[PDB]
Design a protein around this ligand. Structure first.
Ligand SMILES: *[C@@H]1O[C@H](CO)[C@@H](O[C@@H]2O[C@H](CO)[C@@H](O)[C@H](O)[C@H]2NC(C)=O)[C@H](O)[C@H]1NC(C)=O
Ligand SMILES: *[C@@H]1O[C@H](CO)[C@@H](O[C@@H]2O[C@H](CO)[C@@H](O)[C@H](O)[C@H]2NC(C)=O)[C@H](O)[C@H]1NC(C)=O
Ligand SMILES: CCCCC/C=C\C/C=C\CCCCCCCC(=O)O
Ligand SMILES: *[C@@H]1O[C@H](CO)[C@@H](O)[C@H](O)[C@H]1NC(C)=O
Ligand SMILES: *[C@@H]1O[C@H](CO)[C@@H](O)[C@H](O)[C@H]1NC(C)=O
Ligand SMILES: *[C@@H]1O[C@H](CO)[C@@H](O)[C@H](O)[C@H]1NC(C)=O
Ligand SMILES: *[C@@H]1O[C@H](CO)[C@@H](O)[C@H](O)[C@H]1NC(C)=O
Ligand SMILES: *[C@@H]1O[C@H](CO)[C@@H](O)[C@H](O)[C@H]1NC(C)=O
Ligand SMILES: *[C@@H]1O[C@H](CO)[C@@H](O)[C@H](O)[C@H]1NC(C)=O
Ligand SMILES: *[C@@H]1O[C@H](CO)[C@@H](O)[C@H](O)[C@H]1NC(C)=O
Ligand SMILES: *[C@@H]1O[C@H](CO)[C@@H](O)[C@H](O)[C@H]1NC(C)=O
Ligand SMILES: *[C@@H]1O[C@H](CO)[C@@H](O)[C@H](O)[C@H]1NC(C)=O
Ligand SMILES: *[C@@H]1O[C@H](CO)[C@@H](O)[C@H](O)[C@H]1NC(C)=O
Ligand SMILES: *[C@@H]1O[C@H](CO)[C@@H](O)[C@H](O)[C@H]1NC(C)=O
Lengths: 672, 287, 98, 49, 98, 49, 49
C-alpha cells in the first residue's frame, strides 16, 4: 500500500466543442495536482486484488508488461444480491456485461474464473474480434451513466509512476443505471509476472486549460494548489510580472456537522385527519391545530394516495429537513370540477362565497377521490355550498348564516318574489361522471424559519461543537460558521437574531435553550510577492491580520517573522537599506537578490550643514545640463455600433432591442 | 490603480529634497526663534510641537491596520464597524510611508531653509536678500532687525493658540476621512436589500427551495450586489481625480513657495511673499 | 465579456433561437440585452474619466510650450531643475517631449 | 426614458395594475423599478463628471 | 452539442460558398458566409466556438468537410452633410474600402 | 420597416421619414429629428442582407 | 422517491396514455409491482431490483 504522487496526471477533454489557441476555465471532477495515489503490485510473491471504494470517481493507471491487468468489476455489495458491471479484455475482444453476478473471491484469467452464474441481466456489449506500457483511465458515474476516458504513453520507469502531463479522450458512455460504491481489478496469473497499478480519487476543482493551435490540450493550471496558482486563474494568464498582488481573503473549510432539533417522540395524527369518519361541508369548513409531532408521511405510501398535491412557499424535496411553526389543517368536501378553484388567485362560486386562499399563501393543498364512501346509489344530499351573497369573502373567513337572499338588500320572507335560500345541495351519486363525484380536501398552512417550532421532519440530532468551523442545522436553518456562547437575552417568543446586514448571528439552542453566536470562518487579507515567473517560481506571502510572534496561515515553509505590515513568510530579512524595489508597505520593501529579501526603506543621502554667522559660500564654476520631460497629450478615438455588439445580425433580437428602449443615442453622444 | 496613485501623490510632495539635513542644535538664528517648528531633542517625539497639535485635531477611524480574528470574536458584544467590514470582504491597506518618515522629510526641509548644492548663509543676510525681491531696500531690515524678529516670534505664537483651540482650518482634512468611512459603511448596509427576490438572506433561500428554484432567486441577488460594487468603484475613481489635482497643486507650492520667492499675486499668501514653511498633517500638509 | 450568461440559459443567441419559440425566447433574450447594455455603459463611463485625466495633462503641456519654449521662466522647477535657459519640443506618439 | 419597457409587458404603471392582480403585478413592477433606478444613477454619474 | 443521428423531416440543399446566406446545420440556424477551413476536428467533435462563444466552425454532415462561418456585416460608415436647410445632398465615407 | 411619424397640433399626421431609404434618412431616425446640423456623423456599420 | 427519479436539469419529453382495455381484467391483474420500503432515496436514472 505504498504512497506515490500524481504530479500532473488525469486531465481529460471536458466537452465535445472544438477550441484552439485559447485558454478555457471550467469546474468539474478532476484529480488535483500532486495528490496521493496508492500502489498495488502483482507478482509471484504477492497477488493484490482487494476491494477499493469508488468515492465519486477514480483515476486508474497501470504500469506493466505482458498484459497482466485485464479489466474491472464495479458494484455495491459484490455478491449476487445486487447488480454489477464487468469490463474485460479476454484476448479476443472487449466484453461488457452488467448482471447479477456470483462474484468469485479470487477473480483472474488463466495463462477463466470470474463468476459462477448470471441472471436478471440488463446491458451487453461486444467488440469486433523495466515496464514499457502505461495505460490511464478515468471513471465517473453521473445520472446513471458510467463515463470512461483513455490514454496511453510509452515509458521505461522500473517500478514507479512516471511524472508528466497527458490528456485523456472519451471512449465509452454506458447507460447502466446501477449504484456503484466499490470496484475490484481482474489480474491474470501465469504465480504472476511483474506488474503494478495505481488509484487516485477525484474532487471538484476549477482548472484552466490551454488549447494549442491544433486543438490539443498541452498544459493546465490547478487554481487550488497554492496562492500563486490562484493568482494565475484570476488573471487568466500563465505568466506573471514582478510585483505584489492582492489575492482572496484567508479561507477555512468546515470540519464537522451539528444538527439540533427539539425533543419530539410522537408521530403526527395522519390517520385522524385523512381517515376521519366525517368531514364537513365546504361552506361550514372546520380548522384544527397540529400539536408537537414528527411529520414523516412515508407511512402514507402504504395506504393513502392523492390525486392532487401542490406546495407553494416551499419545495417538495425539502419537507423532510425543515421544522414548521403554527400549523393548521382545514377540511371540507367539494365535487371534482371544483377542486381547481382551491388555489390562490382563482374565481368561481367556491372561491367567491365559500373558501378563499390568500395571495401570499404558504402551505400545501391535498385532495383525493372518495366516491366509495361519500356516495350512495340512492343519492346523498348532506353536502351544501353557498351560491348567493352580497360581496366576496376575505381569505380564511367563513359564513354559516342561512338568512334568505333577495337581490339589492330589501329583506324578504322565504315564500315571496325575488326571495331565495342561499344554499344548494350537491347530490352525489354512484353512477355519475367523475366531474360530479365527491372529493375530500385538506389544506395545510404554516410559517418557516421565523419563530419557535414544534413540528419537525424525521432527522437525528448531534452534540454541539463550539469554537470550530462546522456545518450547522438549527430547526431547519443551515449554514457554515463558528459557534460560541452569547450574552444576549432572548424573550420567550424570539428564536433567531439578526444584524443590520440581515445576517443570522444568533440562535437559541432548542434542546438546552442556550443562546449562541454565529460568525463566519473566512477572515483576513492576503497578498503574494513574486519576482516574476520567468525569473523564479518561489513566492512570499504577507498576512495582514496575523501576529506570528494557532496561526491562520496556509503553510509555514521558512523565513517567518513579524513586520509592520504583517506576518511575512518566505523572505530573508537584511539590515541594510536600499531603494525599495517592490513596495510592501509601512516602510518595508522587497527585492530579489538568489532569494527574496525584505528590508527597511532608505529616505536618501545624509549630510550636515554647518551654520556660521560670519561665513558665506559662492560658486566659481558652472556646467550646462539638458533634461527631458514626457507628457501624454491625446488618446485614441473610438465608436460603437450598439446593434452589432448586441444581437449581432439577428433580426428578431434587433426588434426586441427597439421595444427595450435602447438608450444607444446618449452612449454615442458621450463618445463623439 | 487608485491605491498605487496614493503613494505617488505623497512622494511628489515631500520627497523633493534629495539630500537629508540634520536638525540644527541651536534653534535661534539672528533673533528668530525656530523652536516649535523643529523636533525637540529633549522631547522623545520625532515630530515638532506645531505638528503635535495638528494630529490631535483630526479624528482617525483606525490607528493600526491589523485586526486579529480573536479580537473580533472576543468582542462580539460591541457592534464594531471595522469587524463588520472585514467579515464582508472589505479591506483597508496601510500607506507605504510611515507618519514618522514624513515628519523626517519636513524636518529636513525646514533645516535646509534655515541654514541655506547647499551654499550656507546666515539667517539675517538671507532675509535682507528677500527684502530686495519685495522692492524694499536692504538697509531697512538691518536698521529694524530687532522689531522684525519680535513680530516674527509673536506671529508664530498667535498661530500656536489657534490650533490649541478648536479650529475649522482642518475641516478639509476631516472631510476626506469621513467620506471614506461613509462609503464603506454604505456597502455593508446594502446587503439587507431585496433586489426583487423573495428574501435577502442566502441561507434562508437555500434552506426551503430546491436547486432549480433557488437559482432564480440567487441570480437576482447576484445582479443587484454586483451593481453595488460597481457604483462604489465609480465613486472612488471620481474622488481620486479630485485628490490628485489637489496633490499636484500642493507640490507646485512646495517648489515655488518653500524653495524660492514667488512673485505671483496671492499664490503664497495675501501680502508680499517672503518665505514659507511646510508642516505634515494627517493625509495632507500645512503651509 | 460577450461570453458571459446574465441569468439566461445560454450566451449564444443562435442556440436560444433554435430550440425556443417566440414567447420562451423573449424571456432569455431580454436577460442578455440587459447585461450587454450594462457592459457598454461601464466602458463609456471609464472612457470619460480617462479623458479627463488626459485633458489636464494636455493643458499643462500647452502652458509649458508658452512659458518654457517661447520665453524664459522664473518659476522654480517648472522648466527643469536648474536655472532655466531655453527649451526645445520634440514630437512623440500621443505626446510631446521637452 | 419613462416610455421604455425594461422587459415588462407595459411601461404604464396604471395599465399593469388595472388588469393584473397583486402577485402577477409584482413581477412586472419590479422590472420597471430596476430600469428606472438605472436611469437615475446614470444621470447622477454624468453630473459628477 | 455533438454529432446527431436522429433528425426531423426536412429537405437538404447544396452548399453555397462565399456568399451571405441563411443556414441550418443539424438544427443550428444563423446567417453568415461559409468558406473552407483548415481546422482539424477530432472524430467526436461537431462544432467549434471562439472566445466570445460565437459559433465559427462546423463539420458538414454529408461530406464531413470543415467549414468556417463569419458574419456578413463589417466596416465603418459616416455621413457628411452641409445642413438640411442649405441642401439635401450628402457625402459618404467608407473607412474600410479601397 | 421602421417609420418616424410626425403628429401636428390637431392630432393629424402630416409628415414621415423612412429610416431605410438612404443614409441621411437613417441619421434622422437615430437622432429623432427632421432637421440636421452641419458636420460629420457616425452611422451604423455597412450591412449585407 | 424509491422507483424512478428524473434529474433536476432534465431535457426531454414525457408521454402517458390510458391502457385499461389491455392491462386490466375482470378478475384483476396482479403482475405489476412497486417498491414502498427502502433505506434512503434513489439517485436520478438509477434502478433497484
Ligand atoms: C361583514 O359584515 C358586514 C355587515 O353586513 C358587511 O357589510 C355589508 O356588506 C354588504 C356587501 O357589500 C353591503 O351591501 C351592506 O350594506 C353592508 N352592511 C353594512 C351595515 O355595512 C360586510 O360586507 C361583511 N364583510 C365581508 C368581508 O363580507
Ligand atoms: C448504494 O448501495 C449502498 C450499499 O448497498 C448503500 O449504502 C447503504 O445505505 C444504507 C442507507 O443509508 C445504510 O443503512 C447502509 O449501511 C449502507 N451500506 C453500507 C455498506 O454502508 C447506498 O445507500 C446505495 N445508494 C443509493 C443511492 O441507494
Ligand atoms: C395531521 C398531520 C398533518 C401534516 C403535518 C403538517 C405539516 C407536515 C409538513 C409538510 C406537509 C407534509 C405533506 C404530507 C402529505 C404527503 C403527500 C404524499 O404522500 O405525497
Ligand atoms: C445467491 O447465491 C446463494 C448461494 O447459492 C443463493 O442461496 C441465493 O439464492 C442467491 N440469490 C439469488 C437472488 O439468486
Ligand atoms: C471472449 O469473449 C467472447 C464473447 O463472450 C467470446 O466469443 C470469445 O470466444 C472469448 N475469447 C476467449 C479467448 O475467451
Ligand atoms: C430475478 O430472478 C428471480 C429468480 O432468481 C426471479 O424470480 C425474478 O423475477 C427476477 N427479477 C427480475 C427483475 O428479473
Ligand atoms: C500541429 O500540426 C502540424 C501538422 O501535423 C504540426 O506540424 C505542428 O507541429 C502541430 N503543432 C504543435 C504545436 O504540435
Ligand atoms: C402495509 O399494508 C399492508 C396491508 O394493510 C399490511 O399487511 C402491511 O403490514 C403494511 N406494512 C407496513 C410496513 O405497515
Ligand atoms: C431534551 O433532552 C435533553 C437531554 O435528553 C434535555 O436536557 C432537554 O431539557 C430536553 N428538552 C426539553 C424541552 O426538556
Ligand atoms: C504581537 O505580539 C507581541 C507579543 O505578544 C506583541 O509584543 C506585539 O505588540 C503584537 N503585535 C500586534 C500588532 O498586536
Ligand atoms: C570651470 O571648470 C572647468 C574645469 O576645468 C574649467 O575648464 C572652466 O574654465 C571653469 N570655468 C570658469 C568660468 O572658470
Ligand atoms: C523660543 O521659544 C521657546 C518656546 O516658546 C521658548 O521656550 C524659548 O525660551 C525661546 N527662545 C529663547 C532664546 O528664549
Ligand atoms: C450521404 O450521401 C451522399 C450522396 O448520396 C454521399 O456523398 C455521402 O458520403 C453520404 N454520407 C456519408 C456519411 O457517407
Ligand atoms: C388645426 O385646426 C384648426 C381648426 O380649424 C385650424 O385653424 C388649424 O389651421 C389647424 N392646424 C393646422 C396646422 O392646420
Amino acid at each position: 500500500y505504498t504512497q506515490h504522487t500524481s504530479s500532473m496526471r488525469g486531465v481529460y477533454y471536458p466537452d465535445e466543442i472544438f477550441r484552439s489557441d485559447t485558454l478555457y476555465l471550467t469546474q468539474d471532477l478532476f484529480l488535483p495536482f500532486y495528490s496521493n495515489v496508492t500502489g498495488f503490485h502483482t507478482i509471484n510473491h504477492t497477488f493484490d486484488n482487494p476491494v477499493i471504494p469508488f468515492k465519486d470517481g477514480i483515476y486508474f493507471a497501470a504500469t506493466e508488461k505482458s498484459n497482466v491487468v485485464r479489466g474491472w468489476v464495479f458494484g455495491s455489495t459484490m455478491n449476487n444480491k445486487s447488480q454489477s458491471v464487468i469490463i474485460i479484455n479476454n484476448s479476443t475482444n472487449v466484453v461488457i456485461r452488467a448482471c447479477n453476478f456470483e462474484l468469485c473471491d479470487n477473480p483472474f484469467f488463466a495463462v477463466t474464473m470470474i463468476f459462477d452464474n448470471a441472471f436478471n441481466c440488463t446491458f451487453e456489449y461486444i467488440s469486433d474480434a523495466n515496464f514499457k506500457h502505461l495505460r490511464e483511465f478515468v471513471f465517473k458515474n453521473k445520472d446513471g451513466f458510467l463515463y470512461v476516458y483513455k490514454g496511453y504513453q510509452p515509458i521505461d520507469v522500473v517500478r514507479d509512476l512516471p511524472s508528466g502531463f497527458n490528456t485523456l479522450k472519451p471512449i465509452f458512455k454506458l447507460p447502466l443505471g446501477i449504484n456503484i460504491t466499490n470496484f475490484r481489478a481482474i489480474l491474470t496469473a501465469f504465480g504472476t509476472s511483474a506488474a503494478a497499478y495505481f488509484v487516485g480519487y477525484l474532487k471538484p476543482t476549477t482548472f484552466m486549460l490551454k488549447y494549442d493551435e491544433n486543438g490539443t490540450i498541452t498544459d493546465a493550471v490547478d487554481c487550488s494548489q497554492n496562492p500563486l496558482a490562484e493568482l494565475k486563474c484570476s488573471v487568466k494568464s500563465f505568466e506573471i510580472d514582478k510585483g505584489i498582488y492582492q489575492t482572496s481573503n484567508f479561507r477555512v473549510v468546515p470540519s464537522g456537522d451539528v444538527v439540533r432539533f427539539p425533543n419530539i417522540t410522537n408521530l403526527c395524527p395522519f390517520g385522524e385527519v385523512f381517515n376521519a369518519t366525517k368531514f364537513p361541508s365546504v361552506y361550514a369548513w372546520e380548522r384544527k391545530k397540529i400539536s408537537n409531532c414528527v411529520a414523516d408521511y412515508s407511512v402514507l405510501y402504504n395506504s393513502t394516495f392523492f390525486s392532487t398535491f401542490k406546495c407553494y412557499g416551499v419545495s417538495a424535496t425539502k419537507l423532510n429537513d425543515l421544522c414548521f411553526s403554527n400549523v393548521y389543517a382545514d377540511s371540507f368536501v367539494v365535487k371534482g370540477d371544483d377542486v381547481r378553484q382551491i388555489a390562490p388567485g382563482q374565481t368561481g362560486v367556491i372561491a367567491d362565497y365559500n373558501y378563499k386562499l390568500p395571495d401570499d399563501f404558504m402551505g400545501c393543498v391535498l385532495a383525493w377521490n372518495t366516491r366509495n364512501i361519500d356516495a350512495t346509489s340512492t343519492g346523498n344530499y348532506n353536502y351544501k355550498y353557498r351560491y348567493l351573497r352580497h360581496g366576496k369573502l376575505r381569505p380564511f373567513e367563513r359564513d354559516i348564516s342561512n338568512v334568505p337572499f333577495s337581490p339589492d338588500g330589501k329583506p324578504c320572507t322565504p315564500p315571496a318574489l325575488n326571495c331565495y335560500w342561499p344554499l344548494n345541495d350537491y347530490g352525489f351519486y354512484t353512477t355519475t361522471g367523475i366531474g360530479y363525484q365527491p372529493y375530500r380536501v385538506v389544506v395545510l398552512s404554516f410559517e418557516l424559519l421565523n419563530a419557535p417550532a414544534t413540528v419537525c421532519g424525521p432527522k437525528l440530532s448531534t452534540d454541539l461543537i463550539k469554537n470550530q468551523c462546522v456545518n450547522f442545522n438549527f430547526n431547519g436553518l443551515t449554514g457554515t460558521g463558528v459557534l460560541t456562547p452569547s450574552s444576549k437575552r432572548f424573550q420567550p417568543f424570539q428564536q433567531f437574531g439578526r444584524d443590520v446586514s440581515d445576517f443570522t448571528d444568533s440562535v437559541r439552542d432548542p434542546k438546552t435553550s442556550e443562546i449562541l453566536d454565529i460568525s463566519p470562518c473566512s477572515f483576513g487579507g492576503v497578498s503574494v510577492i513574486t519576482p516574476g515567473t520567468n525569473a523564479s517560481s518561489e513566492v512570499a506571502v504577507l498576512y495582514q491580520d496575523v501576529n506570528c510572534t494557532a496561526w491562520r496561515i496556509y503553510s509555514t515553509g521558512n523565513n517567518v517573522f513579524q513586520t509592520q505590515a504583517g506576518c511575512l513568510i518566505g523572505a530573508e530579512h537584511v539590515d541594510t537599506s536600499y531603494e525599495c524595489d517592490i513596495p510592501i508597505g509601512a516602510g518595508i520593501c522587497a527585492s530579489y537578490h538568489k532569494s527574496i529579501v525584505a528590508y527597511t526603506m532608505s529616505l536618501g543621502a545624509d549630510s550636515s550643514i554647518a551654520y556660521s554667522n560670519n561665513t558665506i559660500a559662492i560658486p566659481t564654476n558652472f556646467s550646462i545640463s539638458i533634461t527631458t520631460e514626457v507628457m501624454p497629450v491625446s488618446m485614441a478615438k473610438t465608436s460603437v455600433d450598439c446593434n452589432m455588439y448586441i444581437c449581432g445580425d439577428s433580426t428578431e433580437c434587433a426588434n426586441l432591442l427597439l421595444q427595450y428602449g435602447s438608450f444607444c443615442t446618449q452612449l454615442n453622444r458621450a463618445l463623439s | 490603480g487608485i491605491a498605487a496613485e496614493q503613494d505617488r501623490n505623497t512622494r511628489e510632495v515631500f520627497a523633493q529634497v534629495k539630500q537629508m539635513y540634520k536638525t540644527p542644535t541651536l534653534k535661534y538664528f539672528g533673533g528668530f526663534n525656530f523652536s516649535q517648528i523643529l523636533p525637540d531633542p529633549l522631547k522623545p517625539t520625532k515630530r515638532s510641537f506645531i505638528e503635535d497639535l495638528l494630529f490631535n485635531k483630526v479624528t482617525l477611524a483606525d490607528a493600526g491596520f491589523m485586526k486579529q480574528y480573536g479580537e473580533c470574536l472576543g468582542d462580539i458584544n460591541a457592534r464594531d464597524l471595522i469587524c463588520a467590514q472585514k467579515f464582508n470582504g472589505l479591506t483597508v491597506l496601510p500607506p507605504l510611508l510611515t507618519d514618522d518618515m514624513i515628519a523626517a522629510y519636513t524636518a529636513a526641509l525646514v533645516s535646509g531653509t534655515a541654514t541655506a548644492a547647499a551654499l550656507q548663509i546666515p539667517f539675517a543676510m538671507q532675509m535682507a536678500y528677500r527684502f530686495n525681491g519685495i522692492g524694499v531696500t536692504q538697509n531697512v531690515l538691518y536698521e529694524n532687525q530687532k522689531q522684525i524678529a519680535n513680530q516674527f516670534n509673536k506671529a508664530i505664537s498667535q498661530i500656536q493658540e489657534s490650533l490649541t483651540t478648536t479650529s475649522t482650518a482642518l475641516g478639509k482634512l476631516q472631510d476626506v476621512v469621513n467620506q471614506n468611512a461613509q462609503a464603506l459603511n454604505t456597502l455593508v448596509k446594502q446587503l439587507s436589500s431585496n433586489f426583487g427576490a423573495i428574501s435577502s438572506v442566502l441561507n434562508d433561500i437555500l434552506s426551503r427551495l430546491d436547486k432549480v428554484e433557488a437559482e432564480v432567486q440567487i441570480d437576482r441577488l447576484i445582479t443587484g450586489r454586483l451593481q453595488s460594487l460597481q457604483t462604489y468603484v465609480t465613486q472612488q475613481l471620481i474622488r481620486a481625480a479630485e485628490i490628485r489635482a489637489s496633490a499636484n497643486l500642493a507640490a507646485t507650492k512646495m517648489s515655488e513657495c518653500v524653495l524660492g520667492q514667488s512673485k505671483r499675486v496671492d499664490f503664497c499668501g495675501k501680502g508680499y511673499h517672503l518665505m514659507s514653511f511646510p508642516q505634515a498633517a494627517p493625509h495632507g500638509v500645512v503651509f
